[PDB]
């Protein structure tokens, strides 16, 4: 079956051109294929980004800047999505697609485009104690919300009266936000008697060697 091969991840410098490759399998010939590139940002549907057959047969998607274009390397059987003047706005997943009579719609695996040089940002941490209604149900969930950090790598540690907590912790992987910073959350599931049996609880977020800590008290 025809295969469109894309790199899962690709990072480029701001103010420079990004060259997103899409190599077609030997079954197809790039010179004679309509290439369709789609853009997908987190939480939204894909949108048509660039239709490219040749230099005189381009078509940009509605709302797509003039900075983007296409290219073909026939000795590699590779199509290229070129994005000059790269900005943080251009961070998205880009999907390559062609049509074939056998396997009608064929998508590439997609490429996450990363724009480098974005400022580092410390995590903003909010710790919430269990609600009264939850306590009346004999349960207690501590909630720790971590937002607006860059890069997207944190690690959370829970403490109860300074002592490390191992059971009942569940932490999300980081997620891209609208402003290209990341968010993450950690939950401490306890019973009502485990809560109120300590003077306080701490959520401790480590980000590139620095640490932010919040505490709540029964």
């Amino acid at each position: 079956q025809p295969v469109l091969t894309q790199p899962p991840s690709l990072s480029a410098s701001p103010g420079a051109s990004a060259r997103l490759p899409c190599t077609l399998s030997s079954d197809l010939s790039v010179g004679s294929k309509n290439m369709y590139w789609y853009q997908q940002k987190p939480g939204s549907a894909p949108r048509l980004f660039l239709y490219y057959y040749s230099d005189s047969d381009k078509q940009l998607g509605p709302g797509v800047p003039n900075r983007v274009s296409g290219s073909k390397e026939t000795s590699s059987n590779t199509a290229f999505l070129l994005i000059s003047g790269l900005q943080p706005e251009d961070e998205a997943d880009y999907y390559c697609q062609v049509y074939d009579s056998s396997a009608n719609w064929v998508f590439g695996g997609g490429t996450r485009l990363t724009v480098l040089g974005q400022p580092k940002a410390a995590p903003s941490v909010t710790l919430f104690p269990p609600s009264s209604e939850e306590l009346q149900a004999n349960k207690a969930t501590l909630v720790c919300l971590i937002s607006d950090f860059y890069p997207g790598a944190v690690e959370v540690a829970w403490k109860a009266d300074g002592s490390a907590v191992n059971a009942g912790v569940e932490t999300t992987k980081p997620s891209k936000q609208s402003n290209n910073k990341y968010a993450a959350s950690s939950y401490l599931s306890l019973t009502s008697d485990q809560w109120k049996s300590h003077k306080s609880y701490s959520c401790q977020v480590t980000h590139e060697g620095s640490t932010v800590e919040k505490t709540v008290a029964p």
């Binding site: 057959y53 909010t126 919430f128 919300l145």
Partner: protein
């Protein structure tokens, strides 16, 4: 030009579901339509294709024999019938319009997409969430900003929609992606950051909607 989908949700393995895509703002009977699929965290995979007249269908190998793409032009509705559902069928499903044209002769790219509906195939039971207020510690209320929250706890079928004050409070909302705990259930949280002064000027209620369990709760958060 609108492609509004509906009909997702939870289905037991071997079960069935039907997806719908209502179209508006164009001659629906003039365009090819398609269903595209996206597993959580994975890429796009084409599922099905229907011509404008409806007499020509196309299916991907992973789907042949189990799904059926339909079209009702009298009501501008695209259908995706899904039988003998497998766990690998768990994904977000999109409808997409194929452009009309009449070697580059057929350009044929996907002009408009639907919003996507999540289908989850699982033997687990539907469980609606408990909604708990996340109230500040009265020390940030004597600061310049305060953070209010809602905890949407222990719901199995994704997704859950969270709004604040019936959609009228959007500036300063963080709705966090859900955590999947080892019990198989999901939990998410939402916080609004507001000026502490605003705590004396308005009330705060979060609108939590979990459609798979018919659980719609408007939770007041008092400080």
């Amino acid at each position: 030009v609108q492609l509004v989908e509906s009909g997702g949700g939870l289905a037991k393995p071997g079960g069935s579901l039907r997806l719908s895509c209502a179209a508006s703002g164009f001659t629906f009977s003039d365009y090819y339509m398609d269903w595209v699929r996206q597993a959580p965290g994975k890429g796009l995979e084409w599922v099905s294709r229907i011509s404008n007249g409806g007499g020509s269908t196309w299916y991907a190998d992973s789907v042949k024999g189990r799904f059926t793409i339909s079209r009702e032009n009298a009501k501008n509705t695209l259908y995706l019938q899904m039988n003998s559902l497998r766990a690998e069928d768990t994904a977000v499903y999109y409808c997409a319009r194929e452009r009309y044209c009449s070697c580059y002769a057929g350009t044929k790219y996907f002009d408009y997409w639907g919003q996507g509906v999540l289908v989850t195939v699982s033997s687990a039971s539907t469980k609606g969430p408990s909604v708990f207020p996340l109230a500040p510690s009265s020390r940030s209320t004597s600061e310049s900003t305060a953070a209010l929250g809602c905890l949407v706890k222990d719901y199995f079928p994704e997704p859950v929609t969270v709004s604040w004050n019936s959609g009228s409070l959007t500036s300063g909302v963080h709705t966090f992606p859900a955590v999947l705990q080892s019990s198989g259930l999901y939990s998410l949280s939402s916080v609004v950051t507001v000026p502490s002064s605003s705590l004396g000027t308005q009330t705060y209620v979060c609108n939590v909607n979990h459609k798979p369990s018919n659980t719609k709760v408007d939770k007041r958060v008092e400080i």
